[PDB]
Amino acid sequence: NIRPLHDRVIVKRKEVETKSAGGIVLTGSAAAKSTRGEVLAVGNGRILENGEVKPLDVKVGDIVIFNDGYGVKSEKIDNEEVLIMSESDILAIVE
Amino acid sequence: NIRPLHDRVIVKRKEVETKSAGGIVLTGSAAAKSTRGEVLAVGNGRILENGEVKPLDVKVGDIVIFNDGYGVKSEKIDNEEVLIMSESDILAIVE
Amino acid sequence: NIRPLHDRVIVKRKEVETKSAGGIVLTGSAAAKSTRGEVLAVGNGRILENGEVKPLDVKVGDIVIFNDGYGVKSEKIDNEEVLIMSESDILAIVE
Amino acid sequence: NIRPLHDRVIVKRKEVETKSAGGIVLTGSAAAKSTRGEVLAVGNGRILENGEVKPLDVKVGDIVIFNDGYGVKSEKIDNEEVLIMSESDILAIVE
Amino acid sequence: VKAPGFGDRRKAMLQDIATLTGGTVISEEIGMELEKATLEDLGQAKRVVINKDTTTIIDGVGEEAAIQGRVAQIRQQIEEATSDYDREKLQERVAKLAGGVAVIKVGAATEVEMKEKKARVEDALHATRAAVEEGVV
């Protein structure tokens, strides 16, 4: 297992959809990278100016929407791609 | 359903008008894209420096005027694209 | 010995893996620099704005995943290349 | 006799090493300029937001490892090169 | 010193020196780096003399079997060689590996006399080669 530090969350990207709103199969740049994932591990919490920590709002087991950028980092663990990124990159939680 | 995190708001922007100040149909770049929307989900609120959170000013149901920028993102949910963006991009509330 | 100041941590990255997912030997730019290390020294802790100091979450002996960048400085100590970097560059701790 | 203000430290850079790990002599751009020094004087302390001062961690007589950059400035005292740099530029102290 | 040749022939000459001296060539296309080199990848000789224009490797310490294999390979390459320039270069390489290289310098007082004597010496050289290979009548 791998546990992140502070406000970092480990997520696993969902597979890209093949058929889009019907039987039309998309191949190439038409199918963009998925922006939804499964939360695997969560950090302890952010550090406030006072020094106290507060727990993250996102929990393990939820599906989240995130924006890919420079802050989101890819690491190869257990022969499977996972994403390590801060809670500021979590936009919303599905359901 | 989808709920945002902290001070993010999901909006559904309105369609561009065709007839402008009469019957004159605008086609091309003349009809600028709409900068108004309907808020669908409202986040819990911004986290202050001390640690406390405060509720957001905009409630679900009203009309907002915003500015499109790099921080604003577009997401496709329920086969209908929505707009996810922070409260700092909200300028005013119509009515 | 060498001890860091404030929130800096000294790590020594692991040797790059050659055989990947089987016997295939990797040579060239495909074999990227390893982003895992074993912590050797840990600083006292970061100074808060109010004045007190808080200890780092990483202890000596752990294996960490770090993000290489301009913040990470490469320093050659006792004929052994080790990396001195701030704790903000440490992403997660393995196990 | 000069004393730095606030969180600044005056150091003298150690001479570059020519004989490297055996008999081989190094001349030219290969011999990078040394990144170790000797602290001569230490400022009173960094000024916090509230108003009180915090004494510096480095003490006179120590050997320090620093990162050369735009913040480190070179000036002449008693016809000898010394470096005026902030205490934040010191990475670690040897022994 | 700089390695002789230009291109593929440079690689061939380097490999010939490696086989003669008993060493290994450090190349990126084979998967080795100069920082990893050890004393085992270094060739050996007995005497090396370098001047303003020439380099001579005297009495390389290498096993004769490898040299024989290399010269046999170059002979096979010769057997499938078309142009005379390529054959001349290959035979020079075989001479460097196994035999020697001799040069005859023609001396004459003027330039027309030099040209005539040089032409006659070249004819004699060709005739002796032919007689050695196929007999005389």
Side-chain angles (χ1 to χ4, degrees), chain A residues 1-14 16 18-48 50-69 71-79 81-94, chain B residues 1-14 16 18-48 50-69 71-79 81-94, chain C residues 1-14 16 18-48 50-69 71-79 81-94, chain D residues 1-14 16 18-48 50-69 71-79 81-94, chain E:
Chain A
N1 261 328
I2 290 187
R3 65 179 177 88
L5 288 161
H6 305 96
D7 59 351
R8 299 179 191 282
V9 167
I10 294 171
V11 302
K12 182 175 73 175
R13 190 135 50 187
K14 291 289 188 184
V16 65
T18 48
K19 296 183 290 294
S20 70
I24 308 303
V25 180
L26 294 174
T27 61
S29 66
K33 296 300 292 294
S34 182
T35 52
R36 292 160 197 262
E38 182 65 26
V39 171
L40 283 188
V42 301
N44 189 359
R46 292 183 291 113
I47 302 297
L48 309 163
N50 189 359
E52 182 65 26
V53 300
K54 68 174 293 180
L56 286 85
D57 291 331
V58 59
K59 306 294 184 289
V60 57
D62 299 17
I63 295 93
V64 294
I65 299 168
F66 56 91
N67 48 349
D68 291 331
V72 188
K73 188 268 183 181
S74 291
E75 173 82 20
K76 190 70 181 293
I77 67 168
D78 291 331
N79 294 305
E81 310 271 32
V82 299
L83 277 296
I84 302 168
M85 65 182 179
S86 183
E87 184 178 1
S88 49
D89 294 289
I90 311 285
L91 297 154
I93 296 157
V94 178
Chain B
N1 62 54
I2 292 185
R3 70 158 157 117
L5 283 156
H6 309 105
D7 65 308
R8 295 176 186 280
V9 166
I10 313 174
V11 308
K12 177 70 74 68
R13 71 199 308 163
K14 304 150 74 203
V16 296
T18 61
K19 280 73 176 175
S20 74
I24 302 308
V25 180
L26 291 171
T27 195
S29 67
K33 181 68 174 66
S34 181
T35 52
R36 285 156 190 255
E38 181 65 26
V39 294
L40 295 174
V42 59
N44 296 115
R46 182 176 293 110
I47 297 169
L48 299 156
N50 57 53
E52 182 65 26
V53 304
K54 56 166 308 203
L56 306 175
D57 269 336
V58 65
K59 288 326 280 173
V60 168
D62 63 358
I63 303 295
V64 298
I65 310 155
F66 59 92
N67 63 6
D68 202 325
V72 187
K73 280 192 64 175
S74 59
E75 294 293 328
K76 180 255 186 179
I77 75 170
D78 291 331
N79 292 304
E81 57 92 19
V82 294
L83 202 68
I84 293 170
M85 65 182 179
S86 183
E87 193 191 53
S88 302
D89 291 331
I90 311 294
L91 275 68
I93 294 157
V94 186
Chain C
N1 57 2
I2 289 185
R3 74 201 200 61
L5 292 158
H6 305 97
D7 57 353
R8 292 180 179 91
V9 168
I10 296 171
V11 308
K12 183 175 73 69
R13 66 176 63 188
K14 293 182 183 293
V16 56
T18 61
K19 297 179 178 180
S20 71
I24 310 302
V25 173
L26 268 296
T27 53
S29 66
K33 300 299 290 293
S34 179
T35 80
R36 289 160 194 262
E38 190 276 331
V39 290
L40 307 159
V42 167
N44 267 343
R46 202 202 38 210
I47 304 297
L48 314 175
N50 63 7
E52 292 82 3
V53 61
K54 185 177 180 180
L56 305 186
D57 276 321
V58 292
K59 65 178 72 66
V60 60
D62 300 6
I63 306 105
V64 295
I65 304 165
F66 59 89
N67 169 51
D68 213 315
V72 183
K73 280 73 176 175
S74 180
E75 294 294 328
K76 176 178 168 65
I77 296 89
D78 68 12
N79 299 305
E81 182 65 26
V82 294
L83 278 298
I84 302 164
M85 65 182 179
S86 183
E87 199 282 340
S88 309
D89 314 307
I90 290 189
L91 289 174
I93 321 168
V94 186
Chain D
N1 178 310
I2 67 173
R3 58 182 180 94
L5 288 161
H6 306 279
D7 57 351
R8 293 195 199 64
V9 166
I10 190 167
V11 308
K12 65 164 160 187
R13 210 199 289 263
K14 283 187 180 295
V16 64
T18 58
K19 179 173 186 286
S20 77
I24 320 295
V25 188
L26 276 296
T27 55
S29 67
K33 182 69 176 177
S34 180
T35 46
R36 285 155 194 258
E38 182 65 26
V39 292
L40 300 161
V42 164
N44 290 318
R46 185 179 67 189
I47 315 301
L48 313 170
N50 64 7
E52 293 179 353
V53 298
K54 185 68 175 178
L56 282 69
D57 291 331
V58 293
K59 303 292 183 287
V60 64
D62 285 343
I63 306 108
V64 296
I65 302 169
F66 57 87
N67 174 56
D68 202 322
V72 188
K73 310 202 73 52
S74 179
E75 61 86 20
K76 185 65 66 68
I77 62 170
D78 188 337
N79 294 306
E81 310 292 356
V82 295
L83 296 169
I84 301 298
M85 65 182 179
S86 183
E87 190 276 331
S88 179
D89 291 331
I90 282 171
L91 296 177
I93 62 171
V94 190
Chain E
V1 305
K2 291 175 71 175
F6 287 95
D8 196 0
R9 55 168 183 176
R10 185 201 274 150
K11 294 180 176 67
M13 296 163 206
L14 270 173
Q15 185 54 236
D16 291 331
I17 303 162
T19 51
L20 165 77
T21 58
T24 318
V25 186
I26 307 298
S27 179
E28 294 97 3
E29 293 82 3
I30 183 169
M32 64 184 73
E33 297 91 7
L34 189 51
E35 301 95 358
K36 192 177 169 64
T38 61
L39 293 176
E40 294 293 328
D41 297 334
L42 301 182
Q44 275 207 66
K46 192 257 184 180
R47 179 66 65 192
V48 168
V49 166
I50 314 167
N51 283 7
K52 181 76 174 176
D53 284 342
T54 75
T55 309
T56 296
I57 302 170
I58 292 166
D59 208 21
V61 181
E63 297 179 356
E64 293 83 3
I67 321 171
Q68 296 294 321
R70 184 102 185 143
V71 298
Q73 174 214 292
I74 296 144
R75 277 177 190 151
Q76 183 62 255
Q77 177 156 9
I78 283 174
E79 293 326 287
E80 292 221 17
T82 61
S83 180
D84 288 335
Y85 171 66
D86 294 331
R87 300 180 70 253
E88 279 182 350
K89 302 305 285 293
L90 287 169
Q91 293 179 356
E92 183 185 19
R93 295 182 38 199
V94 181
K96 279 172 190 326
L97 276 176
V101 164
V103 180
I104 288 148
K105 289 185 76 192
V106 175
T110 51
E111 204 53 55
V112 292
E113 184 175 31
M114 176 78 72
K115 289 188 164 64
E116 275 300 314
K117 196 169 176 60
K118 195 181 185 283
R120 285 198 275 115
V121 172
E122 287 164 342
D123 291 331
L125 215 58
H126 282 109
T128 60
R129 291 202 275 261
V132 170
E133 74 184 3
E134 274 211 28
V136 298
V137 290

Short mmCIF file of all heavy atoms in Angstrom, two decimals, chain C residues 27-28, chain E residues 31 33:
data_model
loop_
_atom_site.label_atom_id
_atom_site.label_comp_id
_atom_site.label_asym_id
_atom_site.label_seq_id
_atom_site.Cartn_x
_atom_site.Cartn_y
_atom_site.Cartn_z
N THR C 27 17.58 0.17 -22.78
CA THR C 27 18.74 1.04 -22.90
C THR C 27 18.35 2.29 -23.68
O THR C 27 17.62 2.20 -24.67
CB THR C 27 19.92 0.34 -23.59
OG1 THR C 27 19.48 -0.19 -24.85
CG2 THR C 27 20.48 -0.77 -22.73
N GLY C 28 18.83 3.45 -23.22
CA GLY C 28 18.61 4.70 -23.91
C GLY C 28 17.75 5.65 -23.09
O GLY C 28 17.71 5.57 -21.86
N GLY E 31 25.16 -0.98 -26.73
CA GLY E 31 24.59 -0.94 -25.40
C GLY E 31 25.57 -0.77 -24.27
O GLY E 31 25.33 -1.30 -23.18
N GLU E 33 28.57 2.08 -22.29
CA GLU E 33 28.96 3.47 -22.10
C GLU E 33 30.41 3.53 -21.62
O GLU E 33 30.95 2.56 -21.08
CB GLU E 33 28.05 4.17 -21.08
CG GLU E 33 26.60 4.27 -21.51
CD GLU E 33 25.77 3.10 -21.03
OE1 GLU E 33 26.30 2.27 -20.26
OE2 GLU E 33 24.59 3.00 -21.42
#
